[PDB]
Symmetry: none
Subunit: 378 residues, 6 copies
């Protein structure tokens, strides 16, 4: 046959081009599963892959019109589509895919079989993934104080560990773990450590999602939710005042199934995989809209009881209600978080939590006994 | 005559490409009737069918400029349109078509005379479609407790049976069946089983996506009129709605009460359902109900006597 | 001259392609005047007509690029436009055109001079167009019981006859005949009978109403606008279930089986040929 | 030079293609100034004019690709535009132009210098344009009994006559004469499509807010502050029985009232 | 050497006949007018119409439409930077040239090219009717005198109306909303008709007012750029309002068009030589 | 060896004249400016213009318009990754180069090429009018003194006004909604016109519709916007809305009233207090004002740049 068909066969045997059910080809350049709808980037792959075909097959993929022939041949040999982001226990970094079951990191060609589209945004190295480092203790002390390692603070410790660890897995989690506690207790600190550790797979949302109906109109926070592995719901308003809505029971139902029932911007097909770990940051008594016996199996809560106070107002925090210990916040601590000093240390700690709590199976168990709003059905 | 016309004639002789009234050519690839509007995939069929033509004809369907010529020849020989999805008593699965009258499953070419466009989405296998498998009681328990087979609950039981079994037949059904009863009774569970059983032929609420969807899960006196005709986007839906309160209408007339049906729920696992454990068991149960209640003629009889 | 111009001239000499005032070419394929705006189906006709040209002319309408040169020539040789649907007393069936003045049926080429665009949708056959047939009496009894044939019910019967016969002719009729009466008295069954009889020329509303021959509706300005030759030509017979524009009349499983479809066709043709031979007109 | 430029020059030398201010090239086919915007019809003219060029030039205006080269040349040689519909005293028929000053009808090429785009829609013939005919009095008596020829009914008679006669001239007239259906039908039969709302209105000579309808800009209609308003107090018609007789009467009214200057006094 | 189709493009560009505008549309110079077309760039018309100037071998090949689009592409790939149109304010563009106001010399032809003026009055210009002495200039002077008396009482009003009319020729942005108070049938309509006959096309709603120099909310109409440049003198916060206080068929025949134009040019060159302005 | 057109494309690539942006358009380097267009990729203009640098045999064939599209396609198939633009916040782009706010050095030509700046002021720059001493300098700072008296009482207002005015040059996201409380005919319009003259194209005039409704496409990379819903306050603070490099300025005359007031909104509002035009349009004080702004920036924003809200003066809240 012609050379321009053998070339399109060989480029297809490397499985560099794949077809998705959404109708868009995904190519593999610069060690990343890239895809674009505005411009099909198959000719870029055909040009870049020529350093692997034999001499005569490489000395001819230089004319721009012998590359569109090859692209046209390729587009006529991809009949069946394949699905993306199937492996849930993989963390995609800008230069590879990191395993969770044993911590091995695959980089380059090896990190290709796991068809992962989204990425964290930053690179990876083993120089800061070390078990022992000064930063290891510089976060061990903060973790110990942010959640005391006492027998009274034992259930909360393990529940908080599980909730933070479930932020790396790429699967659907049915739970809306709550973050009960006052301000200056550590909610913002954890919110920034988590963002530094996971990067792009983290979206800070408002209270609009929990008090609206997700059926009509543009749905940006259902659109950009696509394949995100974390959603944070801080700045929650007060419920005792008038005009503040309640926690919509239907919304909780729509955030616990392995494919959220929503539509993209001006689209019709329903395919928006929900992998987020919806974490709600609270300050007051959370009151729901309508309570039924099939709802408490989707709600869990943890409590923070360590007050951070500068000497400006330190002497007025030791006499508070829900605090076992009162600590101080460092001046450059937040800037140190923005400096990504402990990004890899926090990543390592999360990996250890994952391989200590989620090796056999993954599950989040609701804890409705702590929350006393129900108070009627138990 | 040139060879690129003989190739087009031979490709047309296999009845692989068809023209529809909507103006889009449907092709038959990988044992499925596919069709696309943004890009007509006739060239994919032309390339994939080259293994059936003789040697000289096959050795030239490799140039992308000699395949667009064959596509242009094919498009100039399809003058008359062909209607699709005519058989109402068929269930299209991702790898064939299942008959409901007799239960035989056709896979591959034999499932080709039925031009079925939509499909359930998932595959089909006879291993889990067996009559005898311990899941029979494991589903019959819930089916019995949701609707006891007592003499008091006899009309409601059979009416709900007919309403659920009608979800498989892909025709036009005039009925607005309701789910009167209290919450936490099991209606959500039945919705879960139904979604797991029929799959893609099920939407949750909108006139574009209703295209030959065989079941819709959800008062204007005209909307019911607009949802009870052979053509509203063909209408194959079984529009079924859950209610918790005493239903009321806008205006009531004698020519409307023959379009309303009601079931009563009075009988106050989910993760297991999401595992589709009873998917094939529920499919077999629905097939049995359909072949017990809808063999000669398929129809839905409204009951306006119960609704006050 | 070149061969591809002689071929275009011969194709034009058969009067197969016509240009309409709307700007869309109409072609004659499969005994039907087809036309499409999103895609011009002239090359389909060029390919199909190749059996009539001589050997050398036929053996080269097989290249897709030589069937576009011929189409480009044809599109340049059509200068003046023609109007369609000029005959009002013709019924276009999916396989021909039926005359109303005498009832003799044209199938094939002979039903080509009358440029008919729309069609009834279904086929036609004279086997069920017979005079003596059970279905004829099994429908005659319904016609009698719906409208009694009494001296008291004399004017009403003939007015209903004229109103029903008026739905066949393809012209603009000035009338808005009403169907006053109680429910379940005969309006719905007659509506179903007419729908089964005439087919797609029947809509139960300015775009799809174009060229339709019957509209049912089961503002004086609206009456004024719906009485003119061009409101999208208007050929319908508006029936609803300034005085000189309004008329009134005073009043199931087998029907969609079309048991009496051809019987109803014969009945309507008989009424038309007994009531509208010299001139068709509906007096309010 | 090449042949495809000489052919374009010769086609241009016949003044068959013209460029208008609206941006569309009007062409002259079948004794009619046709123009289209969706599909420019210049290739039709190039094909239909080949019977006038010499043998060798004509023998090559048959390839569709050689008829687009000539059109490309022609579109590039047409630099300056020409204004259409300037003569107001000419009435265009589907097969020519009728003059109002003396009644002579020009057919074919003679009706080419007057660049008339719109048309009445129906053909013209002198057989029914005869002064003496049964239809002449069959319509004259209708004219008498719709407007009596009495001394009291004399001023209003001539106002009505002049208002009807102003409908033929293709100029701008600022007047809103206030009115009968028989006259409307007769006028619609007489002038055809030039009788009818800002698109199809263009260059219409008859329509059945004060200032917007009394200005030069095009408006050629006859609408039917105190110096702009005036007041004036079946099946055979659709058979076009008196169409040409009414046209003759209207033309006589024109070249008896509006010979030197055409004007409407409120 | 290089191909002929690049030398031809270079020669055509050397004549400064094609220019690029900030709006993204090329403007060409044909028939002594700066034409421009956006739906279809008319560079090929200029390329064909200019072939009489190049040498014989170059000229004998701008006859193939395929060779007149290679030259057009080359020209489009050699114009990098844009140019600004309608810069000179003291000019009047007539259908056959540009007329200067500070000295009265009329430029027609190639000499009237450096002033990139797009809009035009729409009518031709001649010097036969532009003579100082003629029956028409008194036939208009008496009308001017009776419309506005030349008395000491009506002197300030006369001068204000004078500056108002003389400002209509300048091609710049003028901040003023001069009023025309008075009774009807006194001369306002007559003056409007004379101005329409004098300036024609430049006399007329934010698109059609582009570069218009006359027209028959205060802040937006007294600023240089409303991109639609505004050069009109509006004719119907206190430092922006002024006021003045108070045969047709012959005017429609443009009997006094050139007499009015001569009047206006002397009018301007007597009131707006050093710097033009309008004092409210 | 391979075809000449691929070698030409590679050589044009090695000079780093074409760059691919994340928005999907290619920016090109012509006439000492990063030009980019969407309706027509202007890479062929660059291919024709750069031909003076390639060898003789390579330059003798970038004349056919069909050979400048092969090279364009080759170039488009070798730009795989994207490069971000307008990264340096302490740079002022002028029509003929870039100016460094750190020390006042001006780069003209290729040296102002590493800082990929797409937007520009629109007017040329000359060091002749950038002189420290000039009559216009006094004719300007006298107006500067009378608009804001140099007294101890009017000290905080003076420095806040200077900081707000100097922030107009920094190319970063400024989180603040500084108000301009004062009467009319006090000099506020003079300040607006002076800013427009000084920065030129990096300045827009918005209406009050934005502040009262739930004008964004053209707001991209503008360094100054001139003009109450609470949501819009956070909508104009985050880094990206279309990047947001503007310092939003609101003109008011009366007592401002907010829609819904909370404790987290006071940290986004500042305030300044106010207590020849043809010359401004003449752009006489353009460079004097530019020098004053650069001096203020060099005096107040050396290590970092930040805007501190001052809700103590504004009496609307008055409860928390």
């Amino acid at each position: 046959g012609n050379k321009l068909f053998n070339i399109a066969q060989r480029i297809l045997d490397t499985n560099s081009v794949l077809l998705t059910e959404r109708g868009d080809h995904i190519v593999w350049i610069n060690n990343s599963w890239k895809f674009n709808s505005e411009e099909p980037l198959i000719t870029k792959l055909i040009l870049s892959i020529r350093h692997q075909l034999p001499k005569e097959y490489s000395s001819e993929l230089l004319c721009p019109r012998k590359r569109k022939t090859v692209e046209a041949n390729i587009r006529d040999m991809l009949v069946d589509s394949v699905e993306t982001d199937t492996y849930p226990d993989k963390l995609p970094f800008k230069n590879g895919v990191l395993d969770l079951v044993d911590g091995m990191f695959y980089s380059g060609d090896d990190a290709k079989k796991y068809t992962c589209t989204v990425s964290t945004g930053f690179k990876f190295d083993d120089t800061k993934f070390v078990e022992d480092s000064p930063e290891m203790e510089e976060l061990m002390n903060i973790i110990n104080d942010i959640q005391p390692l006492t027998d009274e603070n034992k259930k909360n410790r393990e529940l908080y560990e599980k909730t933070l660890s479930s932020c790396l897995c790429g699967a659907t989690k049915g739970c809306l773990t709550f973050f009960f506690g006052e301000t200056a207790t550590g909610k913002s600190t954890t919110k920034r450590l988590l963002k530094s550790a996971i990067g792009d797979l983290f979206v800070e949302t408002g209270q609009t999602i929990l008090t609206d109906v997700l059926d009509k109109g543009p749905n940006p926070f259902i659109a950009n939710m696509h394949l995100k592995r974390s959603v944070f719901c801080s700045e929650l308003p007060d419920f005792a005042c008038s005009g503040s809505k309640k926690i919509r029971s239907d919304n909780i139902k729509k955030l616990t199934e392995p494919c959220v029932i929503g539509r993209p911007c001006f689209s019709n097909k329903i395919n928006n995989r929900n992998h987020a770990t919806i974490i709600i940051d609270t300050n007051y008594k959370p009151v729901f809209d309508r309570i039924d016996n099939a709802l408490m199996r989707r709600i869990a809560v943890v409590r923070f009881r360590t007050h951070f106070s500068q000497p400006s107002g330190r002497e007025a925090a030791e006499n508070n209600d829900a605090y076992d210990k009162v600590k101080l916040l460092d001046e450059g601590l937040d800037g140190k978080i923005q400096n990504n000093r402990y990004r890899f240390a926090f990543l390592y700690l999360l990996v250890k939590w994952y391989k200590k709590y989620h090796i056999p199976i993954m599950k989040l168990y609701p804890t409705p006994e702590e929350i006393p709003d129900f108070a009627f059905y138990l």
